[PDB]
């Protein structure tokens, strides 16, 4: 966290910095998107 790193998740890839936030993902949701179809949030597949 707080470091420029790459991402290889179960269903998400890219490059960026991870930070804690107040967002919430449903139990049937993994990763979010903004208005421009770009990812701006993700839930960890192992931790809650």
Partner 1 sequence: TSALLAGTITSGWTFGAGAALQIPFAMQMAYRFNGIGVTQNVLYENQKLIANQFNSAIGKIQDSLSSTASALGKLQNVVNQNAQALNTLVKQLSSNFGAISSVLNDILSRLDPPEAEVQIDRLITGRLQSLQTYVTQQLIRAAEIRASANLAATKMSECVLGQSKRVDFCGKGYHLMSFPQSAPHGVVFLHVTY
Q: Which is nearer to partner 1, 13 or 21 (CB)?
A: 13
Cα 29 to Cα 43: distance, rounded to the nearest angstrom: 8
Q: Which long-range contacts (CB under 8 A, 24 or more apart) does 14-23 make?
A: 14/39, 18/42
Closest approach of Cβ 2 to partner 1, in Å? 25
Q: Which is nearer to partner 1, 15 or 47 (CB)?
A: 15
Q: Which is nearer to partner 1, 17 or 35 (CB)?
A: 35
Q: Which residues bind partner 1 (CB under 8 A)?
A: 13, 35-38
For residue 10, how many other CB atoms are within 10 A of its CB?
Answer: 10
């Amino acid at each position: 966290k707080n470091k420029c790193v790459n991402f290889n998740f179960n269903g998400l890839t890219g490059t960026g910095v991870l930070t804690e936030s107040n967002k919430k993902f449903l139990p049937f949701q993994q990763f979010g998107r903004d208005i421009a179809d770009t990812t701006d949030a993700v839930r960890d597949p192992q931790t809650l």
